[model samples]
Target chain A: AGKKVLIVYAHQEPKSFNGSLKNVAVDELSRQGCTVTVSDLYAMNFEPRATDKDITGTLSNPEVFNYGVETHEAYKQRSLASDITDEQKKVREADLVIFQFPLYWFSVPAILKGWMDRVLCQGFAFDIPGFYDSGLLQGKLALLSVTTGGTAEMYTKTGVNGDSRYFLWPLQHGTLHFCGFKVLAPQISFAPEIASEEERKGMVAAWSQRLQTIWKEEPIPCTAHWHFGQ
Target chain B: AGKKVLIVYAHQEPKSFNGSLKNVAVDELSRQGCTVTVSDLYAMNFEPRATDKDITGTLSNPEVFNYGVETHEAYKQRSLASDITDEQKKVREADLVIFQFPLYWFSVPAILKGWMDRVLCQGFAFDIPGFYDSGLLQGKLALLSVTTGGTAEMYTKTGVNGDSRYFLWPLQHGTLHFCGFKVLAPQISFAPEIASEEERKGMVAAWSQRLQTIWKEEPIPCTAHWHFGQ
Candidate 1:
C-alpha cells in the first residue's frame, strides 16, 4: 500500500534553505508514489500567539473541548483553526507525519510552537490523565526534519563542547515523543547557509531521498508509562 | 548610592507563580531603595518572530540600530513596538538585571528567547565579533532567578542521572556572558507548583534576601574574551 504523508512546515519564508529543503522533500515524496500534504504555515500568515479569544471560542465557534481541546467563554484561541480540517483529517489518515522547520535558537520557530500550543490542545492531542487516556493520533510515524545555520560541530561535544547527539531531547523527545507518535531519528543539515551551492544541491538531494523513505524507518520507542486521571 | 535594578520578567500571566516572583523582586528592590523597572514581556505582548519587514526595514520602517536606545525603525515597526530605547536605558541605568522565569522544557520560555533574539540584535547589545572585538555591555551585573517544577534533586548529575548544571550554559554563557554581562551564580527554586504555600513564601523571601546581597555585592569580573563570535 502507498503511504499517506503530511509535512507541516514552519518557516518565515519559502525562499530560505528550509524552503528549498521543503521543495526537495515534496518532489521526492511525490516521485516515490507517496501522497503528500504540505502545511506552509508562514505562507498562510499563521499567527504564533494564543490570543485570549481562542480559549473563549468567541471568534471561531466550534465544539471546543471534545477530548482535550478547551474553550471557555472568555479567552481567544491561539491554535490553528479546524478550518484546515483537511490538514487535521490528513493527520488522522496519514501513516507518516513529518514536522519540518529551521532551528531557531535551538528551538522551532514561534509559529510552529504556536501551532502545537493551539492545535495540540487538551483533547485531540492528549487526554488530561483522564478517561480514555492521552495521546496523539496514535500509531502514526513521526519525523523531525530540521535545518540549521550552524555546523554539525557546533552541536557536538567537539564544537560547542556541549552534548552532541540528540541534543533536542525536549523537542524531539518531549513534545513529539510524548504525544505517542513514533519519532524517527532526526535528519539534520547543518551549515546550510554556508554550504557551497553544490553542497546545498547535495543536501536537497539527500533530503529528497529521506522523504521518499518515510515510514520505512522505525520511530524511537517510548520509554515511560502514562499513568491516570487529569 | 542605592542600587537601581532591572527585573526582566518573562511569563504569560501576571497571576502565575513566576509572576509572583516578579512582583516580589520589585517590592524587595524598592525596599532596598533601588529604583526598579520590570520588563514584563507577556503584558507587553512582545513579538518573537522577526519579519522581513524588521530585517529589511522596508515594510516595517524601523528605528536606527543604536546600542543605547530602541529607536531604530527596524526594531520599532512590529505588531507590538518595543520601547527598546526605554529597555536599553533601563539596562544601562540599572546596577543589576535579574531574569525570572519558570524552567519550561529545560529552557527559558519562548518569549524570553524571543527577547534575546530581538533586543540583543547586533550593534546595540554587542558588536560584530562580539565575543572578541567589543562587548560594551561588559562589566554590568546580571543574574538568573528561576523557578522550576522539578525538585532540586531532579536537576543534578546524580539526580537526573547525568548533569543538570550544564542545562543552563546556553542562557548563562551563550547569551549573558557572551554579551559581556558579569553573571552571578543563578538562584533556582525547584518544585514551585507542588511547594506548600509557606514553602513558596519562604522561597520568595530567600530569593529576595539573596537579591539584596547581590545588588550590593562586588561585581564579578567580566571575561568576554573566553567566548567566540556566534
Candidate 2:
C-alpha cells in the first residue's frame, strides 16, 4: 500500500472525463498511502515529436540522425533533455505506472506515445539482448486506463471496429510487455461522453474501487494468443 | 495512369532508410505521370495535441472536452484549424494516401499518429452510421509502408514480437478500413539499420517497383482472420 505510482496522463481539458479518471486514481491511490505523481502531458505542454532536440548534447553522429541509436547513446551519457530524464526519474521511482488517456486512433495520444518513444530509450527500457521477459524495467507494473469514443459493442470481434483486444496488442504487448512491465488488465471505459451522467460517475467509482485492490491482481499473460484470442 | 498521391512521410533524418523509401515512391510515381504530394511531418512541425485550440469557435461544451464530439462539430462548421483543413483537402484530392514511416513501438510514430487523430475527424472521414463499408471516403485508397528495427524472423507467429499482422490490426482494420479506404497490405522493411547497404537499396528499389503496379493490386481483406489467423 505504500508504493510509488506514476500517472502519465494525456488529455487537454482538465475538466474532461479523462481528467476525472486521472483525478480518481490520484485520490484513491493517495488515500491508500501511495505516493502519486502525475505527468499531466498537456498541462506540461510535452513535446510529442522525437527528434535531435531530445539529445541536449553534441550529436553522436552529425552526418546521420537515427532517433533510436542517438537517443540510446544520449541516455547512457546523461545528455537526454531534462524533460525526458525528469519523466524517467519518475518512472524509475514508481512501483506502478498508470497510463491514463483517451484512446486516439485506436492507440494512445501522440504526447503519450512520444513519452514512450523519447523516455524509454535503448539503455533505459530495453537493450538488444535484454527485452520482453528480460527487459530492463522488470518488477515494475503498468496499467492502461483508457476511455474510448466507441461503445463496448463496437470494439468486438464481429463488431464494426473489430475486437478491442486487437487494438491493445501494440500497447499492452509491444510497448509495456516489451519493457518488462507486468501489465494489469486494461480498464476500458467505453463511450464516457455518450454515457449518461450516472453511468459516467459509476465508471469513475468502479475505477476507484479497482485501485483499492490493485495489488491483489495478477499480470495478464501478455502473450500473442491472449491478445489475439487464437 | 494519372492520379494524385499523398505521401505522409514521418522521419527525422532525410538520409535515413525511411527517406530512401519515400524518395523512391515519389520518383517512381512521378515518372508514371502521377501527381505526388509529400507531407514530411517532422518538417511541417505539425501540432499533434488535440485541444480546444483545434476549434476556432466555442466548443460544443466548454465544461467537458470530448475530442471526437468537438472535432466532429468543428468539421461541419468549417472551424477547425487551418493546418488540419489543409491536410483534409489533400486527402480529399488524393486517390491514394500512402503513409511512409519507421514503425515506433510497433505502431506509427506519434507525429503520424497525431495526423490521423487530428486530420481524420468525424465528418471528413466517417460519421455515426457511415463507417466501415459505408465510410465517407469510399473511393480513396490507403497504404502503410513501414520500416522496423526488428527482423522479419522476430515478427513471426512464434517470434519474440509475435506476427507483424498483430500490430497492423489497429491501423489497417480499425482506422483505414473504418474510414472506408481500401487497405493495401503493408510493406514492412525489416531491420534496415542492421541490413547491408545493398539490402537497403534493394528494399527501396522493391518499393519503387511496387508503386508502378500499385493500382493493379487488390486491397487485402481487412478482417480479424486476416490479421489474427484462425
Candidate 3:
C-alpha cells in the first residue's frame, strides 16, 4: 500500500445517506491507487460518547493532547499517534490525506473532532504558543469531502438559500488550515436526501477522479490566501 | 415548574477544575427559582457512544429515541403516564436549555453530541424541511457556561493561537442557534488552572448571580450574523 489515506467516518447506520457518501469516497480513493483505511466510527462502535476511558486515554496520551510543551503529559503520547500522523506517515511515504464525512450542523461529526483532539497533538501537527507561526505541518495536503442534505446552490455566500461558505470557514481555517494542512477546496455534495440515483452515481464517479488526482500532488495549495512557505 | 431547564454538563472528572463551573451553574439557576435538570454526563456514567438503540431505542425503549413518542404500541399506552413523558414534558415546557461543558477541540464532548442526536430527533425537534428551521423551540434561550484551563490570551486571530471566537462559532451558531435557541454571550472563565481559592469562589459567585438574574430575561446579542429571524 502506498501513501496511506485514513478516512475516519462517523455515521451510525451503514444504510444512512452518510454511509453512501463513505462508500463512494472509499471507491474513489481506491480508484486513485491510494491505499485507504476507513475508520467507520459507528461500525467500529467508536464510543462517540467520550467515556471516562477515552477521556482518560486522551489525558494520558501526549500525542492525543498536544497543547505544546505546556500540555499535560497525558495527551502528548496520544496526540503523537492520531490518524493525522498516521496519514502523515503515509503522506511522507506517498502524497495526500483525504478527510471524508457528512456535515452535521455545519461542522465535522463529534467523533471526528475527538479524533483531532486525540490525534493532531502539539509538536507533531502544530505548535503550542506559536502554532501556525511555528509551521509544524507545512508540507502535508488535506482534502475534505463532506456531504450535506442541503442543495449546492443554497450554500453560496449570498445565494438565495444562505451563506454556505460561513459553515466551512471554521473547518477550513480553524481546524484544517490552522493545524498546517494545505487544504484543498473541500468537495461538498448537497441535497443528499433527494439526490437522484443518477446524481449519486455521478457524484461517486466525480469524487473518485478527484481523489485520484489529489493523491499524486504535493498536498499543499499554491495560491491559498494563507502564506505557508515562509 | 413553570419553565424547566436541561443542562448537559461534560467533564472527565466530576471533581476536577471543570466541575466548579458546573456547580456554580446549578446553584445560579436554582436560586433563580428555575427548576433545573442536570445531566452530569461523566458522573451519571452516560455513554458517549451512539448505537442503533439511540435512533430507534430498541436497546432502551423506542420512546428514548423518539422522546415522548413510543414506537411500540404497548409502551405508548404507559408512556402517557411514565417518567420519560414527564421529562419530555419538562423539556417541552422548558423555556431555556444550557449546555455547560469544557470546550474540547472546538465542540462538545462526544457523549453530549450523542445526546443531541438522540434527543433532538426528526419529528420531535425537527421535521422534514422542519422546525429546526422554525417551530416549538423557536423562541427558547440557550446558554453556554464553559471553564477553560488556558488563559484568555491563547485564542487569537492572527496569532499562532487559534481564534477563541472561531473555536466557539460552531458551538454558538451551529448547535444552539441552528436548533433555534437564542444563544447567549457565553459565560467564559479563562485560566481556571491558576485560579486561587478566592478567585474560584468569587468567579462561581459572580456566575451564579448572573445566571440567576438572566434566568427569565433574554440574554444579549440576539443572534449571530448567520441566523435568520422569522
**Candidate 2, A1-230: lDDT as tens digits:** 47999999998888888889999999999898899999999889998899899998698899989888889989989899999999999999999999999888889998899888888899999898778988899899999999998999988888877788889999988999999899999999999978999999999999999999999999999998897766
For candidate 3 chain A, the 10 contiguous residues with the lowest summed lDDT are A221-230
> CA lDDT, every prediction?
0.62, 0.91, 0.58
From the highest TM-score down, the ranking of the candidates is: 2, 3, 1
TM-score of chain B of 2: 0.98
Flag regions of model 1 displaced more than 4 Å: A57-94, A127-138, A161-167, A220-230, B55-89, B92-95, B132-136, B151-169, B216-230
DockQ of each model vs. true complex: 0.18, 0.80, 0.28
TM-scores for every predicted model: 0.76, 0.98, 0.77
Error of model 2, residue B48, in angstroms: 1.0
Candidate that would win on DockQ: 2
Best by TM-score: 2
- For model 3, report DockQ: 0.28
Q: Candidate 3, residues A1-230: lDDT per residue as tens digits?
A: 45656676776556655666677767876766667777766565544444334323345433323232323343445433243445345444424556677776667666666565545555556665544424466656677778876687766534433455556655666566666677777777777667888987778677766666764554433221232211
Model 3 stretches with alpha carbons more than 4 Å out: A13-17, A49-95, A122-130, A133-138, A158-162, A216-230, B1-3, B55-90, B129-133, B149-151, B154-164, B194-202, B219-230
- DockQ of candidate 2, scored on C-alphas against the true complex (2 decimals): 0.80
Q: Using lDDT, give the best candidate's number.
A: 2
